[PDB]
């Protein structure tokens, strides 16, 4: 997306639903990588549940 | 047969001096604290720069995050999803990663009720 808009003052707009977990995932999206341990029963991210609730 | 030569490289390796020496030799055929001395030796023939030049160098990028509330249908679907047996799954009851990913996907497609709830005509 940045490559195609390589120059000429490109404008990027992002739509995110307010008061939803989408904002939490946007601000913090590294959880997918932090849990790169063996799949099929990771069972990690205990404290990160606060984002799903809010 | 050429009187001059020009080479383009993205970035060379720090260690493995063999490659650097071979490149310097093939530049011109007239040659037979560690990193500091290596850079000092490569002073006469070197021209490198970093991306710090992009500052005010016509590189103008703009990003605007626009917040948008949910519709009544979206609110209803969200309340329904969060208020379901999945609550226990969200509380890490079993297969935590799987149920979390499933709930995230559901809430993601819930950004438009027409996707999960396809409005259809009321035929008679």
CA distance A45 to A32: 10
User: Cα–chain-centroid distance for residue B101?
Assistant: 21
Residue B112: CB atoms within 10 A of its CB come to: 13
Q: After which residues are there C–N gaps above 2.5 Å in chain B?
A: 32
* Residue matched to tokens 């710090």: B52
CA distance B93 to A46: 11
CA distance B109 to B97: 18
- The string of DSSP codes covering chain B is --S------S---SS-HHHHHHHHHHHSS----HHHHHHHHTSSS-----GGGGTTTT--EEEEEEEE---HHHHHHHHHHHSSTHHHHHTS-SSHHHHHHHHHHHHHHTTSHHHHS-------
Closest listed residue to residue A12, CA positions, set B58, B65, B54 = B65
Angle at A47 between CA A41 and CA A52, to 5 degrees: 85
**Closest to A15 (Cβ–Cβ): which among B60, B68, B74?**
B68
Method: cryo-EM
Q: What is the largest CA-CA distance in chain A?
A: 47
Chain A hits for B54, CB-CB cut-off 8 Å, are none
Q: Is B7 on the interface with A (CB under 8 A)?
A: no
Q: Is B47 on the interface with A (CB under 8 A)?
A: no
Chain A hits for B64, CB-CB cut-off 8 Å, are 11-14
- Alpha-helical segments (H) within chain A: 21-27, 31-34, 49-53
């Amino acid at each position: 997306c940045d490559r195609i808009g390589r120059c000429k003052d490109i404008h990027i707009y992002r739509l995110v639903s307010g008061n939803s977990i989408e904002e939490k995932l946007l601000k913090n999206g590294t959880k997918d990588l932090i849990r790169e341990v063996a799949a099929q029963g990771n069972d990690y991210s205990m404290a990160f549940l606060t984002q799903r609730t809010i | 047969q050429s009187q001059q030569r020009l080479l383009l490289i993205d970035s060379p390796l720090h260690n493995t001096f063999l490659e650097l020496w071979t490149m310097v030799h093939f530049l011109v055929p007239g040659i037979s604290k560690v990193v500091i001395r290596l850079h000092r030796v490569t002073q006469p023939f070197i021209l490198r720069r970093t991306k710090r030049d992009v500052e005010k160098q016509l590189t103008k990028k703009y990003e605007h995050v626009l917040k948008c509330r949910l519709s009544n249908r979206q609110k209803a679907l969200y309340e329904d999803v969060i208020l379901q047996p999945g609550t226990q799954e969200a509380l890490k009851s079993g297969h935590f990663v799987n149920v979390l990913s499933i709930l995230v996907r559901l809430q993601r497609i819930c950004n438009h009720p027409g996707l999960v709830e396809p409005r259809h005509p009321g035929s008679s």
